[PDB]
Amino acid sequence: ANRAYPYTRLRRNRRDDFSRRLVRENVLTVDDLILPVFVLDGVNQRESIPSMPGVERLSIDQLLIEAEEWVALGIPALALFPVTPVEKKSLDAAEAYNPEGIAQRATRALRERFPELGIITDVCLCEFTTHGQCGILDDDGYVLNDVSIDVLVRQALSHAEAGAQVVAPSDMMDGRIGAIREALESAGHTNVRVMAYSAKYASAYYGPFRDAVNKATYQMDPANSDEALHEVAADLAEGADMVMVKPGMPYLDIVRRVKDEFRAPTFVYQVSGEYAMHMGAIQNGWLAESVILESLTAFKRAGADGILTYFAKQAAEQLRR
Amino acid sequence: ANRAYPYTRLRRNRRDDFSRRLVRENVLTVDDLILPVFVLDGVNQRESIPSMPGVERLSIDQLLIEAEEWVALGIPALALFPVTPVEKKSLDAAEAYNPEGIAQRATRALRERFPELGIITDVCLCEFTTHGQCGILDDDGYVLNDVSIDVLVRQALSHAEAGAQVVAPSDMMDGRIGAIREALESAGHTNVRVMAYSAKYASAYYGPFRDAVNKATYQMDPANSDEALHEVAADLAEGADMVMVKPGMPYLDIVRRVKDEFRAPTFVYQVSGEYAMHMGAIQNGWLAESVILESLTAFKRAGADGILTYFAKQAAEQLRR
Amino acid sequence: ANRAYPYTRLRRNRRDDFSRRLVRENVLTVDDLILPVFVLDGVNQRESIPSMPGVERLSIDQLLIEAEEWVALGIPALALFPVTPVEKKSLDAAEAYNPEGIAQRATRALRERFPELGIITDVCLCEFTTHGQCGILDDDGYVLNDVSIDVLVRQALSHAEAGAQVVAPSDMMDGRIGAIREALESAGHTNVRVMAYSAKYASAYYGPFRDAVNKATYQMDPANSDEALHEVAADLAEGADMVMVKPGMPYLDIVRRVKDEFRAPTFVYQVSGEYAMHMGAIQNGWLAESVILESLTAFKRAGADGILTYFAKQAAEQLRR
């Protein structure tokens, strides 16, 4: 309000650590972190991912072991991403709802072993189709909206039955949130949260995910911002408990507008390519390790309530010290 | 959007600790706490304050002893309140700017031993006038505005000279922020912060401070909210680095409006009477100790960047667990 | 608008009582007060509450006597809180809807004796369950949402049948307002108001209520503010005539945001622990009695239309003089 130099010098609050601490507008805590993890079939399996240095795909027995540390660090939740054996992929994506699928078995195992740990399952067909699209194809190769929802609903129900506290539809079909919510309510899964991937973009930043585990007709055009508000509005009306933006850093303006417009629990995914970029630069000595906390603090400043990040264990370790 | 039961059940996020953690909107940290402390003239002395159970007036040697632990707990700053010997009070309030006054001695001692600890001095005449009004009286007993500013300016300079990083005018004279800022700038105290008590009310909640250590013509009417915004706007234009509301909990609506309107560093004082009423109830077994963190979290939720609170040590200890 | 010292001196309107009166932004009146009262079974019963000095639990005959003064003072309404005999508590909470329960008998007695006095009954199961939770438990000890609503509906209907003009659901089940409204409308209770406890927090300030008469899965996290707006929006859509924030003082920022966002009749509960805090401090001589009116004026300034307060009789007496 009519602030002018030299009466106002914004450097004064910057002069000392104590005053920078008092005026600091945002903080990252371990309550903000969600750890995504790639889950293998089998026993005693651990696979390094070349394009995501430091991240490993884990069979369920190994996941249970590593989760001991994650829980001890106070990380609130995991987001599970199964790595489907290629032979179990099909046109109808039926493995998506197999009670003995990787995601379902992993969920039951973690829910028994660590009852307070949040498990967020991935509701999508892309790791179950032979073609790798997020839904079922018609005879022109188009991803059918409503037919795909029918399969996503079965999948979500199977995750709820396995004990997941949160299902996270990452498919970008229109209307899927309401369809899934209706099915959960009808089946008695009253308190299963739905974390909608509301504004999920058709992005180049997904590169490394493929190595861990057309799209422009469902995923959003990177150019568009207003459209993300309409996407989130629909998902909230349809019953989502949380809404998500993906990717993350390249979309912090979207996080900001979404938080400002709806004042709802807003989440963001720091995707594989964001992780890879940062880690490559750190390893090369081009960026200091402090960039990890800075990247995560950005999400908080931009309005996120929680962050899906492959840095979650390291960040949690740094935060505790 | 159009969120409606049962598609929207706001209890889902409440169902488990992990989700409550993920969606929690505010957190209290040690970086938010400012510890006020009453300082005595002598050596190896403490006094218990009857109307503030658990709070002690401390001689400077005892202040340095207790500050070692405050610093270890990570408390960023102290607010010093001298307890002036009655023999040093006067109509002209000259003790306010004595280079060997309690505040100035305490400041030099703390700046030397704990160089990173913030020291916020109190710029006001009420502890230095025989009558205890915050400024100089005319012959009808009205508190003169501009004559009082002249004394306040000298006092503020004396604090800067003693090494205080922040001076906090608590007097509610009109225009004093700008006068003090000009004086600091002209004397080369470029980086001395001014924490304005901007919206300071004429309140019954100050009961116990008089024990620890006319008003309606300068302090604000408890009925008034819009007026607080005009007070803060003036102080920001006059060069304040931070602005404060006092009292605190009884005025959380004012905190909220002030933060929302100006988005400037906004502080709040949980005053003596607020401390006493909480502590009295805790000691009677009427409220759990958890009320302390609840009361301080309220300030964060209401938009405060920092909190002057007699519970700062107790809070810092609890937060360290 | 470009107001600057010394052209603008905000002390001028403060200089005299007459001008402070002319610019005073808010006023407390007896039209703003609701008196909560604890009601005992039996005849000629009066019980002091150690943790709420000055408040008595009253059998219905004694309540009728005391209500003579309350009505003569112009207090518009009472909020009734029965003290259920321990032997009448059960798993199914059936006493909640007993036409011969304390609340129902008290309502009929007051409606006959004082036809213009508002009676606000408490719709909740916590004073009727053996376990003291606000709803019915499942086999995991979780408070079931929709099953509890069924009982709350019967309770609300029983209160309407007893002649209550207002029912006030304090249970924090999702969707209960709409369920209760639907039931009242279907039964012909067209003009029975519903005063929703919309943003009711899981708070330490409830201590003394227990002596007068888990929760984090239904009552709100003190940290959360945006969430309160979503709570109130739902209750207004579901048909509430009034909406309430509880507790009070520690949540004045919430009152302010709720009034600003919805422009609906907004109420606030100055809870047992707030009363106890203030009264303890007054009795100890730490705060002047004037703090009572200041506390209540705060609620008006923050945007409340009415206040549930155990100070209502004393405040009404002070206001009349």
Add this chain to the structure above:
Amino acid sequence: ANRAYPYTRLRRNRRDDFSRRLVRENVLTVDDLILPVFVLDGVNQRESIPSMPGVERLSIDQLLIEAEEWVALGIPALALFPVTPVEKKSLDAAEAYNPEGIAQRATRALRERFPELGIITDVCLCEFTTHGQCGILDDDGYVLNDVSIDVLVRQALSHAEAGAQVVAPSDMMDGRIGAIREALESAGHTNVRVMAYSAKYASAYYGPFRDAVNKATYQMDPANSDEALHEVAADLAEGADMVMVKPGMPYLDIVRRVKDEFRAPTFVYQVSGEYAMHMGAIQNGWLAESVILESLTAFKRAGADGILTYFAKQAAEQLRR
């Protein structure tokens, strides 16, 4: 939110007096009333005003008699309007600043007898010029702006010297607020309030004031609303402590906009013609007496902090019941 019949029936809160009381948004109190009064030159004289039934011009002795009752009723302030003897009018308006003029004598007399009663003097030349324009005329009959300010400044100082707490420039010269403020500050009248007639319209509702006691080049076009906001902004920047709209009821939309835009102390004048049309209709039996309180409540609802009204005594009497 999405409030819809029959879930929402806005008549429920209307059903009973107690609920209408609880939700009532505004109230009129005595603290809102300013009583205008026409003051004569002589001794033991009153005159009935034909076009304002029930209002009397009062000599100063009679003014002191009536003020005893105004003070007893708790009316905070009077607005004095002298009735200048024709022989004292002139082209230079010099009687405006005569230390023994009616206004100045009346002010001294009231300040001495009733020290707590606010006195608001009228700063304008229209009762002092032979032609009755509010400023000094040039040779073409245009009302000169800055030449008129010089006289207005002298008049305002004379009022301050006589002890008025508030001076109220009613002239609608550009820039006069700042000129008067500067003069007051430079003369040491630090605390004299300036109540600007900010949005004063060229209105037919002034009919009866001329009986009681060119204009379109200074007073505002009744058609214009946005222009009123610019007028008020200038007066606030120039140092006004209060701002006023005149006339009143015919301009309630302007009151509302002005309060909403500036959130400053906002006053309204229910002018002679508004009084006369109400009083005439009441006397003819065409409107009930209750219309008086209704008209004044309108001002409060529209956002006025205070009301200059010829009904102030009658209102205060009714409010005291």
Add this chain to the structure above:
Amino acid sequence: ANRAYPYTRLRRNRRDDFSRRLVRENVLTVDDLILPVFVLDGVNQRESIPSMPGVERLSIDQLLIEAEEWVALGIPALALFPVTPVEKKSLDAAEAYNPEGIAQRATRALRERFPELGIITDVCLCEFTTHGQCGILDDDGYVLNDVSIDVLVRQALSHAEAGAQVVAPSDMMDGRIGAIREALESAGHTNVRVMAYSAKYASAYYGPFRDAVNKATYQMDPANSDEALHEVAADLAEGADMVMVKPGMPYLDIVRRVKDEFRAPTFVYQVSGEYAMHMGAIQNGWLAESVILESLTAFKRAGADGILTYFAKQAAEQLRR
């Protein structure tokens, strides 16, 4: 934007008629006027109304004659108010929907004679009940909401059948707009407009209407402003084509807020008592005739699209000249 004297002198645009005309923000035209008219049974009947000087009650033959002038003046619409013979009043208000009632006969006669003239009929039971309440009473003397709607629906249909282009429900029952709209749509009266009396206050300004032709449980409390927005929102959702505030001048702040919030066609009624007030003062010589156009211009400035005014013929005459 930083406008300051003397760079900005707001008197410059006021200096000459031409510039005042160029900047004039609002204009009144005959397209804004609706003429209310009281209609008698019988032939060759004309009755002066003592409390509304210049207004006559007219039998239908006389109405047709006078309407010649009104149409020639360009007045767009009449609002018809029948004066029901006392013997035709009843408990069931059945005369309200008599195809041979005054309003119905008058409507058919005017629709035939002047096909382009708008006819707005009055949907309410108060001129048809023996008791004069706007709806049907229950055995406690309360105006039943939904039972009254059933009769209002029959009335509205009868007006549509008679050829009215607009029906204007003035009853203040909850939900009546949607009920009437549903009935009109079901019956094929697709283009019959509904002009809701949305915010109709329980006012003293209605005095003279009674002579031309309890309420607090349906009509609004004069104190309330926010409530008017909720009233209008419901009426727009329920299908109103126009919304109305009544009374007029004493509620211009309400007109302003309603226009600003909803941007819908907004109408205002300058009621009998407003007409009487002004006319009495004009006749007495207390106000100039120019007050008529000023009063009407106020409504435009406040945001009204049209005005129901007993001044419509005189205003139209003045506008044309």
Add this chain to the structure above:
Amino acid sequence: ANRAYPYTRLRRNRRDDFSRRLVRENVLTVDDLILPVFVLDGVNQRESIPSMPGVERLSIDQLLIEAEEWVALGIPALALFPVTPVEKKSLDAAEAYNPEGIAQRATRALRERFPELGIITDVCLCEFTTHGQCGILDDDGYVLNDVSIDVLVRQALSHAEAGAQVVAPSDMMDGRIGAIREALESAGHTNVRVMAYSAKYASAYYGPFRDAVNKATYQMDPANSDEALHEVAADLAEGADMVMVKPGMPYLDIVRRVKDEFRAPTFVYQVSGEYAMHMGAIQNGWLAESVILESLTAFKRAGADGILTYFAKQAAEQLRR
């Protein structure tokens, strides 16, 4: 609110002329029109402008003849554009401030014959420089800002001296409004209005003006909208009484934003090319004459207070019917 078909049918208000009239949001009146006119040096001369069919350059005697009818039609003001004889142009533009230049002679002649008619002179050098740029060129052919202001100031004073009520700087030099205002104030031309061409674009729509009578370094880029708000803010702060956008129809969005942002008197120029394209199409039989009123109504709807238009006579004639 939630307006939905078929409860809401927006065609109902469209059904009849009377209702379209009642809800019509904007109207054009004669008071909105400013007539631009090209003025020749000689006597008893007119010239037809090839690129503006129907518009004539007029010698001053012929201007006085045509103005009699313009005044009779009620047109409030003319904007004069001299057509400078080539022999009077120069690098220093000195003819701009000649007391016997065309503009000055025309102004004196019109002020004398038609004292109530507004005269708006054109403050710019483009009709006075040999090269036709709006300011003075440096040796590289850049239009110098502040050197050009000095000439513009002299020109503006010459217009004031000739009696113009309004001067309208059309030059788009930075800072010229304030410079001209200061000069007018210092010379005693207190009431001379300054109509700033604030947002004047570098447009192809000026084609025909050059026939009638580099630019991208001063006139605005057609692509830019936010920049127009900054231009207007500066001009208002510098003391403009009115602000203008030019061209007009191609910039109606700018009109709307400017009115909405500043709520100041906002004017628009329908330039030569807009006139020519409309008139050409009307003459070819491609558009009806009704397009003229439609184009001018657009300006009103977009928020203009007044319109400079070559159709002003034709419009005024049509509006008089």
